[PDB]
Design a binder for this molecule. Structure first.
Ligand code: HEM
Ligand SMILES: Clc1ccccc1C(c1ccccc1)(c1ccccc1)n1ccnc1
Ligand SMILES: Clc1ccccc1C(c1ccccc1)(c1ccccc1)n1ccnc1
Length: 394
């Protein structure tokens, strides 16, 4: 009746979510937030944007959406802005990144010894380097860019109800946003082919982005790639380490890797929950929910729901997977804009791990392994051990 268990103890959280799907699939917590646990009900909510709005500022007095952020806005404005941003951040822009992601990955892994932190070595520097280059930032600016991004990632280790959270976020986000806004002005003066240049030049149905909107979107790209590569890649290695036969399977046929990625997403989604606000009195699975309250859709619970997935707690890459049905990227019109980049970056990273090492295991003699306590499902670091590498003279 009391409290939502924390992210850190994954077993207890998963156990609790099980009991809820079973006994209270639509639950109202002590703060008046409504949780939704079943795959079918989560889908219902995510599809009905008219009832379940993505704007959480509407019920907070003088707060308004962040300009250039598509995840806080509803149709029809949502469609119009995602059109503008996509015309810049295009499918071909992402896919063209493969050789460089591979190059950076291969270089970063070649200097890692045999015992190292997978996050410090790879999962943290790779996405920052890639986004920075995508954005067109001078190499000399990259370190500070990653410093700002890292500081924001570190904050997510902290309690979200800590009343200083908002202020701490502001002290890093402000200079980061200032920086990007100044780069947008620069590309406006002299546009090239980098993403910031495409952002300031983009226009769809007469809608163009100002430097504020362009910089905010660029900020979301940085933080999205950084946090998610850190979390998903760690989850990939942790999960494979629990089912180590797949390492050999993927070594013999690297074409098996995209399915592994999808199954790790299902099994250990970087974001276990998403939020909506009701716009009117409504119902989920016969349970009445009043107007103007927050609803939490538990992607984690839905992904483990036996009505949606056979033997839902079995790690099994052989499942049908892929595409728009990957609930870990959400569902419907807000389906992750970065899904192609996520899928690409983590596939290349896993290809390269296997290429050099054959496998990694989570280091047992090291608990630098601190789980994110809220928002994210995974760890800030992942101490690993390579049993084999090209460095062995045997
Ligand atoms: C494994 C990696 C990732 C996961 C698990 C993930 C997850 C998600 C989820 C669940 C949503 C939907 C939020 C909602 O419905 O309210 C979303 C939206 C979004 N994601 Fe990702 N994401 C990942 C990687 C990325 C990357 C690399 C980018 C870089 C652009 C990105 C950018 C975005 C953007 C801009 C939105 C808002 C889309 C919209 O509102 O139309 N994500 N993401
Ligand atoms: Cl964490 C989060 C969740 C949902 C929306 C925005 C953010 C965000 C943030 C803050 C700290 C660490 C990582 C991300 C954020 C998301 C994307 C880009 C920048 C910041 N944020 C919190 C307050 N304003 C913006
Ligand atoms: Cl970029 C970010 C940082 C920290 C937490 C969440 C996100 C973000 C998101 C927003 C709502 C629900 C789940 C995740 C996000 C926040 C603000 C703007 C864009 C994306 N995200 C990271 C990757 N894809 C989406």
């Amino acid at each position: 009746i009391d409290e939502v268990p924390g992210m850190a103890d994954e077993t207890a959280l998963l156990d609790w979510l099980g009991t809820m799907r079973e006994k209270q699939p639509v639950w109202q917590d002590r703060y008046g937030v409504w949780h939704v646990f079943r795959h079918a009900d989560v889908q219902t909510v995510l599809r009905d944007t008219a009832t379940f709005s993505s704007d959480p500022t509407r019920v907070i007095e003088g707060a308004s959406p962040t300009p250039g952020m598509i995840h806080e806005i509803d149709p029809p404005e949502h469609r119009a802005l995602r059109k503008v941003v996509s015309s810049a951040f295009t499918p071909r822009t992402i896919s063209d990144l493969e050789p460089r992601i591979r190059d950076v990955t291969r270089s970063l892994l070649a200097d890692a010894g045999e015992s190292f932190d997978l996050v410090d070595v790879l999962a943290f520097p790779l996405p920052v380097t890639i986004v920075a280059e995508l954005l067109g930032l001078p190499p000399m600016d990259h370190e500070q860019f990653g410093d700002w991004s890292g500081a924001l990632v570190d904050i997510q280790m902290d309690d979200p109800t800590d009343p200083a959270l908002a202020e701490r976020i502001a002290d890093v986000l402000n200079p980061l946003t200032a920086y990007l806004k100044a780069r947008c002005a620069e590309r406006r003066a002299d546009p090239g082919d980098d993403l910031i240049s495409r952002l300031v030049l983009a226009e769809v149905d007469g809608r163009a982005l100002d430097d504020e909107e362009a910089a905010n979107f660029s900020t979301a790209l940085l933080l999205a790639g950084h946090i998610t590569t850190t979390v998903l890649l760690g989850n990939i290695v942790r999960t494979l380490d629990e089912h180590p036969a797949h390492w050999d399977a993927a070594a013999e046929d690297p074409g098996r890797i995209p399915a592994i990625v999808e199954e790790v997403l299902r099994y250990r989604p970087p974001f276990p929950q998403m939020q909506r606000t009701t716009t009117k009195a409504t119902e989920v699975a016969g349970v009445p929910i009043p107007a103007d309250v927050m609803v939490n859709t538990w992607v984690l619970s839905a992904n483990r729901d036996s009505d949606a997935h056979d033997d839902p707690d079995r790690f099994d890459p052989s499942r049908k997977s892929g595409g728009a049905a990957q609930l870990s990227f959400g569902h419907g019109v807000h389906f992750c804009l970065g899904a192609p980049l996520a899928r690409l970056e983590n596939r290349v990273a896993l290809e390269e791990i296997i290429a050099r090492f054959g496998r990694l295991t989570v280091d047992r003699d090291d608990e630098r392994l601190r789980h994110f306590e809220q928002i994210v499902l995974g760890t800030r670091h992942l101490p690993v051990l390579a049993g084999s590498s090209p460095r062995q003279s045997a």
